[PDB]
Ligand binder design. Sequence first.
Ligand SMILES: Nc1ncnc2c1ncn2[C@@H]1O[C@H](COP(=O)(O)OP(=O)(O)OC[C@H]2O[C@@H](O)[C@H](O)[C@@H]2O)[C@@H](O)[C@H]1O
Length: 162
Amino acid sequence: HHAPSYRVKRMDIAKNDEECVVNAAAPRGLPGNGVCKAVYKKWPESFKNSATPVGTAKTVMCGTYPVIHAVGPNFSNYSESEGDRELAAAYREVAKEVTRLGVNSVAIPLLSTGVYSGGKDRLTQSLNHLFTAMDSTDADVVIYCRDKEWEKKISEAIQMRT
Ligand SMILES: Nc1ncnc2c1ncn2[C@@H]1O[C@H](COP(=O)(O)OP(=O)(O)OC[C@H]2O[C@@H](O)[C@H](O)[C@@H]2O)[C@@H](O)[C@H]1O
Protein backbone atom coordinates (compact mmCIF):
# COMPACT_ATOMS: atom_id res chain seq x y z
CA HIS A 1 0.00 0.00 0.00
CA HIS A 2 1.04 3.67 0.30
CA ALA A 3 4.79 4.18 0.80
CA PRO A 4 5.50 6.27 3.93
CA SER A 5 7.78 9.19 3.07
CA TYR A 6 10.00 11.88 4.50
CA ARG A 7 10.06 15.37 2.98
CA VAL A 8 11.56 18.69 4.06
CA LYS A 9 10.11 22.12 3.36
CA ARG A 10 11.64 25.52 4.14
CA MET A 11 8.65 27.50 5.36
CA ASP A 12 6.58 28.34 8.43
CA ILE A 13 5.34 25.15 10.08
CA ALA A 14 2.07 26.98 10.84
CA LYS A 15 1.31 26.77 7.10
CA ASN A 16 1.70 22.99 6.98
CA ASP A 17 -0.47 20.70 4.84
CA GLU A 18 -0.35 17.72 7.22
CA GLU A 19 -2.88 16.17 9.56
CA CYS A 20 -1.18 17.32 12.77
CA VAL A 21 1.71 19.49 13.94
CA VAL A 22 4.53 19.14 16.45
CA ASN A 23 5.37 22.24 18.48
CA ALA A 24 8.92 22.73 19.72
CA ALA A 25 7.44 23.55 23.07
CA ALA A 26 8.46 24.80 26.49
CA PRO A 27 7.86 22.78 29.68
CA ARG A 28 5.56 25.38 31.25
CA GLY A 29 3.39 25.66 28.16
CA LEU A 30 4.21 29.31 27.62
CA PRO A 31 4.37 30.97 24.19
CA GLY A 32 7.88 31.48 22.90
CA ASN A 33 9.76 33.07 20.01
CA GLY A 34 10.58 30.14 17.70
CA VAL A 35 8.23 27.56 16.19
CA CYS A 36 6.11 28.06 19.29
CA LYS A 37 5.43 31.69 18.31
CA ALA A 38 3.83 30.53 15.06
CA VAL A 39 2.01 27.66 16.79
CA TYR A 40 0.55 29.96 19.45
CA LYS A 41 -0.62 32.42 16.79
CA LYS A 42 -2.27 29.73 14.66
CA TRP A 43 -3.62 27.36 17.33
CA PRO A 44 -3.82 29.28 20.61
CA GLU A 45 -6.52 26.97 21.94
CA SER A 46 -3.99 24.13 21.97
CA PHE A 47 -2.09 25.79 24.85
CA LYS A 48 -4.78 24.98 27.42
CA ASN A 49 -2.84 22.73 29.82
CA SER A 50 -0.05 22.02 27.34
CA ALA A 51 2.65 22.19 30.02
CA THR A 52 4.60 18.91 30.21
CA PRO A 53 8.10 17.91 31.38
CA VAL A 54 11.28 18.10 29.37
CA GLY A 55 11.68 14.95 27.33
CA THR A 56 7.92 14.40 26.93
CA ALA A 57 5.13 15.29 24.52
CA LYS A 58 1.53 16.28 25.25
CA THR A 59 -1.16 16.56 22.61
CA VAL A 60 -3.88 19.19 22.81
CA MET A 61 -6.60 19.48 20.19
CA CYS A 62 -7.40 22.74 18.44
CA GLY A 63 -10.83 21.87 17.14
CA THR A 64 -10.07 18.42 15.73
CA TYR A 65 -6.51 19.37 14.70
CA PRO A 66 -3.87 17.79 17.01
CA VAL A 67 -1.00 19.95 18.30
CA ILE A 68 1.71 17.71 19.76
CA HIS A 69 3.69 19.82 22.23
CA ALA A 70 7.15 18.22 22.38
CA VAL A 71 9.60 19.65 24.92
CA GLY A 72 13.23 19.32 23.98
CA PRO A 73 15.92 20.10 26.55
CA ASN A 74 17.49 23.51 26.81
CA PHE A 75 21.17 22.62 26.34
CA SER A 76 22.14 25.78 28.25
CA ASN A 77 20.83 23.97 31.36
CA TYR A 78 21.49 20.31 30.53
CA SER A 79 24.83 18.59 30.15
CA GLU A 80 25.58 17.31 26.65
CA SER A 81 24.98 13.72 27.76
CA GLU A 82 21.74 14.31 29.69
CA GLY A 83 20.40 16.71 27.07
CA ASP A 84 21.07 14.16 24.34
CA ARG A 85 19.05 11.58 26.30
CA GLU A 86 16.11 13.96 26.81
CA LEU A 87 16.13 15.11 23.19
CA ALA A 88 15.93 11.50 22.03
CA ALA A 89 13.13 10.83 24.50
CA ALA A 90 11.03 13.77 23.34
CA TYR A 91 11.03 12.43 19.81
CA ARG A 92 10.16 8.92 21.02
CA GLU A 93 7.09 10.39 22.72
CA VAL A 94 6.19 12.22 19.49
CA ALA A 95 6.29 8.89 17.62
CA LYS A 96 3.98 7.31 20.19
CA GLU A 97 1.52 10.21 19.96
CA VAL A 98 1.52 10.18 16.14
CA THR A 99 0.73 6.45 16.30
CA ARG A 100 -1.98 6.86 18.94
CA LEU A 101 -3.68 9.61 16.90
CA GLY A 102 -3.80 7.41 13.80
CA VAL A 103 -2.80 10.34 11.59
CA ASN A 104 -1.60 9.82 8.03
CA SER A 105 0.91 12.69 8.17
CA VAL A 106 2.73 14.95 10.65
CA ALA A 107 4.53 18.30 10.37
CA ILE A 108 7.59 18.36 12.62
CA PRO A 109 10.41 20.82 13.43
CA LEU A 110 13.94 20.08 14.68
CA LEU A 111 13.69 20.17 18.46
CA SER A 112 16.38 21.93 20.51
CA THR A 113 18.07 23.49 17.45
CA GLY A 114 17.02 27.10 18.10
CA VAL A 115 16.23 28.77 21.41
CA TYR A 116 17.24 25.57 23.24
CA SER A 117 20.41 24.80 21.28
CA GLY A 118 22.82 26.34 23.77
CA GLY A 119 24.29 28.23 20.82
CA LYS A 120 25.51 25.07 19.05
CA ASP A 121 24.60 23.71 15.61
CA ARG A 122 22.52 20.62 16.44
CA LEU A 123 20.97 19.82 13.06
CA THR A 124 22.51 16.37 12.69
CA GLN A 125 22.01 15.46 16.35
CA SER A 126 18.35 16.48 16.33
CA LEU A 127 17.55 15.06 12.88
CA ASN A 128 19.08 11.69 13.74
CA HIS A 129 16.97 11.45 16.91
CA LEU A 130 13.94 12.36 14.81
CA PHE A 131 14.70 9.50 12.42
CA THR A 132 15.34 7.06 15.26
CA ALA A 133 11.89 7.75 16.66
CA MET A 134 9.86 8.27 13.50
CA ASP A 135 11.37 5.68 11.17
CA SER A 136 9.17 2.91 12.62
CA THR A 137 5.97 4.93 12.15
CA ASP A 138 4.16 4.79 8.82
CA ALA A 139 2.92 8.39 8.77
CA ASP A 140 4.20 10.73 6.10
CA VAL A 141 6.67 13.03 7.89
CA VAL A 142 7.25 16.58 6.67
CA ILE A 143 10.14 18.36 8.37
CA TYR A 144 9.87 22.15 8.48
CA CYS A 145 12.88 24.45 8.72
CA ARG A 146 13.74 28.07 7.97
CA ASP A 147 17.45 28.11 7.00
CA LYS A 148 18.44 27.62 3.35
CA GLU A 149 21.56 25.58 4.09
CA TRP A 150 19.73 23.43 6.64
CA GLU A 151 17.07 22.62 4.05
CA LYS A 152 19.81 21.29 1.77
CA LYS A 153 21.47 19.27 4.54
CA ILE A 154 18.18 17.78 5.73
CA SER A 155 17.22 16.90 2.16
CA GLU A 156 20.60 15.23 1.61
CA ALA A 157 20.17 13.17 4.76
CA ILE A 158 16.72 11.98 3.67
CA GLN A 159 17.80 11.19 0.13
CA MET A 160 20.93 9.27 1.04
CA ARG A 161 18.83 6.59 2.78
CA THR A 162 16.55 5.86 -0.21
N1 LIG B 1 7.72 28.87 12.23
C1 LIG B 1 8.80 27.93 12.00
N2 LIG B 1 8.66 26.92 11.14
C2 LIG B 1 9.64 26.06 10.95
N3 LIG B 1 10.80 26.14 11.57
C3 LIG B 1 11.01 27.16 12.46
C4 LIG B 1 10.03 28.08 12.69
N4 LIG B 1 10.51 28.96 13.61
C5 LIG B 1 11.76 28.60 13.94
N5 LIG B 1 12.09 27.53 13.23
C6 LIG B 1 13.33 26.79 13.31
O1 LIG B 1 12.84 25.51 14.19
C7 LIG B 1 13.91 25.02 14.83
C8 LIG B 1 13.66 24.85 16.36
O2 LIG B 1 13.95 26.07 17.00
P1 LIG B 1 12.89 26.60 18.15
O3 LIG B 1 11.49 26.76 17.60
O4 LIG B 1 13.46 27.88 18.71
O5 LIG B 1 12.76 25.38 19.24
P2 LIG B 1 13.72 24.87 20.45
O6 LIG B 1 15.17 25.08 20.08
O7 LIG B 1 13.30 23.44 20.73
O8 LIG B 1 13.34 25.79 21.76
C9 LIG B 1 12.03 25.72 22.28
C10 LIG B 1 11.79 26.95 23.11
O9 LIG B 1 11.68 28.24 22.15
C11 LIG B 1 10.48 28.70 22.24
O10 LIG B 1 9.98 29.04 20.97
C12 LIG B 1 9.62 27.52 22.88
O11 LIG B 1 8.55 28.03 23.52
C13 LIG B 1 10.63 26.90 23.79
O12 LIG B 1 10.73 27.69 25.05
C14 LIG B 1 15.06 26.02 14.57
O13 LIG B 1 15.92 25.51 13.64
C15 LIG B 1 14.30 27.28 14.04
O14 LIG B 1 15.24 28.12 13.26
